[PDB]
Amino acid sequence: SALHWRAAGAATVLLVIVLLAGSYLAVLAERGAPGAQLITYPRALWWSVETATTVGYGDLYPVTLWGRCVAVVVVVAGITSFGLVTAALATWFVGREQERRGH
Amino acid sequence: SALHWRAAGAATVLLVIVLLAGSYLAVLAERGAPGAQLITYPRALWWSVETATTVGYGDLYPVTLWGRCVAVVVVVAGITSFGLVTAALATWFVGREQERRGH
Amino acid sequence: DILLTQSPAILSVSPGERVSFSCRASQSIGTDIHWYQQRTNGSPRLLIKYASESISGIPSRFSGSGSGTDFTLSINSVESEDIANYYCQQSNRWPFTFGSGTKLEI
Amino acid sequence: DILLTQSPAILSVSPGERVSFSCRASQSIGTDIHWYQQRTNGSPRLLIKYASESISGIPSRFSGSGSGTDFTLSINSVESEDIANYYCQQSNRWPFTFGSGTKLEI
Amino acid sequence: QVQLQQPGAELVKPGASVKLSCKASGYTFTSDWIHWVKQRPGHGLEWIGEIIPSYGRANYNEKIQKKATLTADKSSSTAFMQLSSLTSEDSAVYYCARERGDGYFAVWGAGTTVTVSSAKTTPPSVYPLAPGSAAQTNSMVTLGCLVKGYFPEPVTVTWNSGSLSSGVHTFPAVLQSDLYTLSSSVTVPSSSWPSETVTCNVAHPASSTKVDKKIVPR
Ligand SMILES: [K+]
Ligand SMILES: [K+]
Ligand SMILES: [K+]
Secondary structure: OOHHHHHHHHHHHHHHHHHHHHHHHHHHHHOOOOOOOOOOHHHHHHHHHHHHHOOOOOOOOOOOHHHHHHHHHHHHHHHHHHHHHHHHHHHHHHHHHHHOOOO | OOHHHHHHHHHHHHHHHHHHHHHHHHHHHHOOOOOOOOOOHHHHHHHHHHHHHOOOOOOOOOOOHHHHHHHHHHHHHHHHHHHHHHHHHHHHHHHHHHHOOOO | OOOEEOOOOEEEOOOOOOEEEEEEEOOOOOOOEEEEEEOOOOOOEEEEEOOOEEOOOOOOOEEEEEEOOEEEEEEOOOOHHHOOEEEEEEOOOOOOEEOOOEEEEO | OOOEEOOOOEEEOOOOOOEEEEEEEOOOOOOOEEEEEEOOOOOOEEEEEOOOEEOOOOOOOEEEEEEOOEEEEEEOOOOHHHOOEEEEEEOOOOOOEEOOOEEEEO | OOOEEOOOEEEEOOOOEEEEEEEEOOOOOOOOEEEEEEEOOOOOOEEEEEEEOOOOEEEEOOOOOOOOOEEEEOOOOEEEEEEEOOOHHHOEEEEEEEEOOOOOEEEEOOOEEEEEOOOOOEOOEEEEEOOOOOOOOOOEEEEEEEEEEEEOOOOEEEEOOOOEOOOEEEOOOEEOOOOEEEEEEEEEEHHHOOOOOOEEEEEEHHHOEEEOOEOOOO
């Protein structure tokens, strides 16, 4: 269908991939750093979801450079993807409002 | 090209500058305040990225007036810049949807 | 590093009694503790993961409890086959660490 | 202020042995501890930064470990050139602070 | 079936350097980490380090002198640990375990007994042990076998290729002039012997020797 709905879909699939890759890379970057908690996959995945949604619980976060880099990619992909949906919903509303104006 | 893509680009470059200036000023504002943790540049930069993305890990935050002021500027620049991208993506979608309507 | 203290080091129980092994972490670690059993000259065997989750193939009389810094591995009605060394292990913070272990004695 | 306790104040080791200096912080400070060496009448020299990162130009026999509140500076096979005072320093919270120091004695 | 396989023993001269192996089998995920744990006689478990095969990245227990180096052959699903410049302090049983990236070691290898010594590998001498003609017999009979003069540890003593498990005691070896000696005992109903043959199998890894010795009345 329309570009905005495809982009939304694409963004979602992409986000889910970043989430998974992010979980795997966080563990890899963090293991080896004393005091690190982002070291098992199940919670790292919870961490990536937390991060991508910016929910801010603060129960887990990276302590290494590479882990922080992985964090930036994840949050940014999350902010962007959700902003994309917002933009897609606006395109939907703007298009329907034009119709409701018989023009 | 179009205004919205230039603005997005500009916003990004600007955000990166605020991030750096913010890291430097946070250290300057915080050193001298007992209990302060925002006192070395590498982590202050992590803090500014955290702040600008509102990721909410809570591992670092300013404790002084000036540090808090620096925090406001940073988060606001971050919220604004990401909102700008969202708006730019909406302009893109709205423009393409008009084309898809052969008008 | 996270310190895992197992005290007392040796437990003397009578056949059929209920025994309780203790594991105290130096800091809070949720329920990220795991229990292993090692018989004389055998290798470690996972008995309980994440503080209280039973592993398949382990006698129902084995269980664990606790969270934070105090953990317990319990055995309802001990028996000769249970005679061994019992270690706790944590996966909350890097690196993983093991308690010093407690020998069960009937 | 963050208190950095270095105990024992003096370490007696035999040539070739493995020695371990201890540094305990009054609160959790990640791995934000740094180790300095000061020989008789010389000025301090950075040996280990951020708890375990080797500095260029320092004998490979020097290393550090720990995180949170317990830190260790280790020397594999000590030797006359190592005789001195060893201080820890923290950069986690303002102001930076130094431990009271430990003298190595062969 | 055995998911982790390690050679029973390795003898190393001071200053020398051995490479232990760990062949894995069963489900293999990219998220799997292989750990190595050290257990000195009497003492407890000590984490050495870890490695993730699907990347070759390894981490070490930095609280202890670093004597190890980990690598992994993705092709043959084998983990390797390079120990170098060993001393008496490095003699112990080294286990390897598999962790599914979720914090606990679901399965461990049988462990490799590494002995750092200048001595020479010496296979054991298995001598039967049957009662004397003067000793009476109860409802049960006690037989045994003397595994003597071997080096280095360990030795795995079985009875009837594992068939006999109930009534068996194998004592801890003892060192007397760079050579170990131990004895294993077995007890069966007095009636069942010697009609039902009784044999002691003795495998000694350091010399790749496994020998039998049937126990017949004197
Ligand atoms: K937020
Ligand atoms: K938070
Ligand atoms: K938002």
